[PDB]
Design a protein around this ligand. Structure first.
Ligand SMILES: Nc1nc2c(ncn2[C@@H]2O[C@H](COP(=O)(O)OP(=O)(O)OP(=O)(O)O)[C@@H](O)[C@H]2O)c(=O)[nH]1
Ligand SMILES: [Mg+2]
Lengths: 142, 200, 10, 180
């Protein structure tokens, strides 16, 4: 499962954060800072895969804001990238032309979508339309 | 199954059902839902491959039942996209970690070698990880990639360089130890500050 | 800016 | 622009629809087409080439293009796939050996990017003997439930009896026509 998934901007600002492992607040902040420094101190030809703390630290940002994942060394590396791409596509479909400004304003919506998509670091909605329909139904409830 | 081995026998009876489900999923290569990059239900396929690799890892009946499914997946899947490459890597890992046939092992070795020559950093890292995992298993077949392992140490990727160094360390035997000693010394002398201690 | 640009450009 | 003429034409029925006649040889495809057009089981010579006919039902002229199941005519089904909106597959439930061949032919036909907007039309032909399978066993053997992004419907029709042809035509019309 994904130990922690956090969306951090190029400048270092974090637009999202979702850790599935209970860690101390100071320890979590230190881990996030180290991950940001590693991603911010890594080139574009590093394969987007880093083995930091025995965790598959996969960094793959399609825009100025980057995304990071932390999964155990028990599954294929391409699976994490595919899951990240699927989540990005689902978020773009739910919002519509998702940008950095919209992510900050839609932090609650992004957190709800992430919770409804992956729970506990594992994939919960394999399909892309079912999750979107469920999110829309939950939003329409009020 | 991973938590305790008592349910492995109980969970191993559903191997034909899982094989049939995987075959049905592979047959339906097109689907409006879960079909991304030409792969339908990539998460389901990855889960099925992981279950097959972890199911019957020390039994011949489980490997034999899933041998046909693994062979079909190893040849009926296209690795042009990232999902296909991940599925192929998962199938190769499951074949290596299970008591598969000689043909399945040869196909997995060929796939790993082909992915090693890929210029993609992620593909190279996946190939290096597969080679490191298949170090003890198919060790003689892993010796054909000694040049690739040596070249990976000089690669411009930190993860790729680390994977190449790990593969070289795990591939050191009682006959190539003397020959590989000079290469290891050269790598340690001209290695990164974070890898010099590891190389030593 | 670089923030208003789409993450995937789709 | 004005669409008054189109509305007037559609008020009394303007939609026609399309259909295809494909399947294994001796699978009742020609008999099914004859029953749909005429309504009788007439013995015909083997379909070396193809049969062209039109059937009008529910104010829609669903033309059916019969295609043989011969080896020399099996690869010719792609020629009839052009300018075609529907496709009806006739399965041979009484031919266990030919069931695999029919399933493979259906999978090959459905595995083409050109034939994507045509919904699956599986007809359980030879549904008059005890050896014929049901509407679910034949679909399960052919893997019709795994045809993602395809509207496949399994229907059992007997060429001698003609029962189930009306239900299949209604299902095809509902799948194609989405109006009141
Ligand atoms: N007598 C009889 N024949 C049936 C029945 N159901 C399916 N058939 C088959 O339908 C066939 C009719 O032949 P055709 O008119 O040429 O139609 P076809 O089955 O598509 O054969 P081809 O045109 O050569 O591809 C017969 O050969 C039978 O095998 C049935 O209930 N009774
Ligand atoms: Mg005929």
């Amino acid at each position: 499962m994904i130990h922690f998934i956090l969306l951090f901007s190029r400048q270092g600002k974090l637009r999202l954060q979702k850790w599935y492992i209970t860690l101390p607040d100071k320890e979590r902040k230190k881990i996030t800072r180290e991950i940001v420094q590693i991603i911010l101190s890594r080139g574009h030809r590093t394969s987007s895969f880093v083995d930091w703390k025995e965790l598959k630290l996969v960094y793959k940002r399609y825009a100025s804001l980057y995304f990071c994942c932390a999964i155990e060394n028990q599954d294929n590396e391409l699976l994490t990238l595919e899951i990240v791409h699927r989540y990005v596509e689902l978020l773009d479909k739910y919002f519509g032309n998702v940008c950095e400004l919209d992510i900050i304003f839609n932090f609650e919506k992004a957190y709800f979508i992430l919770d409804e998509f992956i729970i506990g670091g594992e994939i919960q909605e394999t399909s892309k339309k079912i999750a979107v329909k469920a999110i829309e139904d939950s939003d329409m409830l009020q | 199954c991973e938590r305790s081995p008592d349910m492995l026998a109980h969970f191993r009876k559903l191997v034909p059902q899982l094989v049939r489900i995987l075959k049905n999923l592979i047959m339906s290569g097109y689907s409006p839902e879960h079909d991304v990059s030409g792969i339908s239900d990539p998460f389901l396929q990855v889960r099925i491959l992981r279950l097959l690799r972890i199911l019957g890892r020390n039994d011949d009946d489980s490997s034999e039942a899933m041998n046909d499914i693994l062979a079909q997946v190893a040849t009926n899947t296209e690795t042009s996209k990232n999902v296909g490459n991940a599925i192929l890597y998962e199938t190769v890992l499951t074949i290596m970690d299970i008591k598969s046939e000689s043909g399945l092992r040869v196909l997995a070795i060929n796939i790993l070698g082909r992915f090693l020559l890929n210029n993609d950093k992620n593909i190279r890292y996946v190939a290096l990880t597969s080679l490191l995992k298949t170090v003890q298993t198919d060790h003689n077949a892993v010796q054909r990639h000694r040049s690739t392992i040596v070249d990976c140490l000089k690669d411009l990727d930190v993860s790729i360089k680390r994977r190449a160094m790990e593969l070289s360390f795990a591939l050191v035997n009682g006959n190539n130890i003397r020959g590989m000693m000079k290469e290891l010394l050269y790598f340690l002398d001209s290695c990164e500050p974070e890898f010099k201690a590891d190389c030593a | 800016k670089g923030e208003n640009t789409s993450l995937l450009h789709p | 622009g004005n669409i008054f003429a189109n509305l007037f034409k559609g008020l009394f029925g303007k939609k026609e629809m399309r259909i295809l006649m494909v399947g294994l040889d001796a699978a009742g495809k020609t008999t099914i087409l004859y029953k749909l057009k005429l309504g009788e089981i007439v013995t015909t010579i083997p379909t070396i080439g193809f049969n062209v006919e039109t059937v009008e039902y529910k104010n829609i002229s669903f033309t059916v293009w019969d295609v043989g199941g011969q080896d020399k005519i099996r690869p010719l089904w792609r020629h009839y796939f052009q300018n075609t909106q529907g496709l009806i597959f006739v399965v041979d439930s009484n031919d266990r050996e030919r069931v695999n061949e029919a399933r493979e032919e259906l999978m090959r036909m459905l595995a083409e990017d050109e034939l994507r907007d045509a919904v699956l039309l599986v007809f359980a032909n030879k549904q008059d003997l005890p050896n014929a399978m049901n509407a679910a066993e034949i679909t399960d053997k052919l893997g019709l439930h795994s045809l993602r992004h395809r509207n496949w419907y399994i229907q059992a029709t007997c060429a001698t009896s003609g029962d189930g042809l009306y239900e299949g035509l209604d299902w095809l019309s509902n799948q194609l026509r989405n109006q009141k």
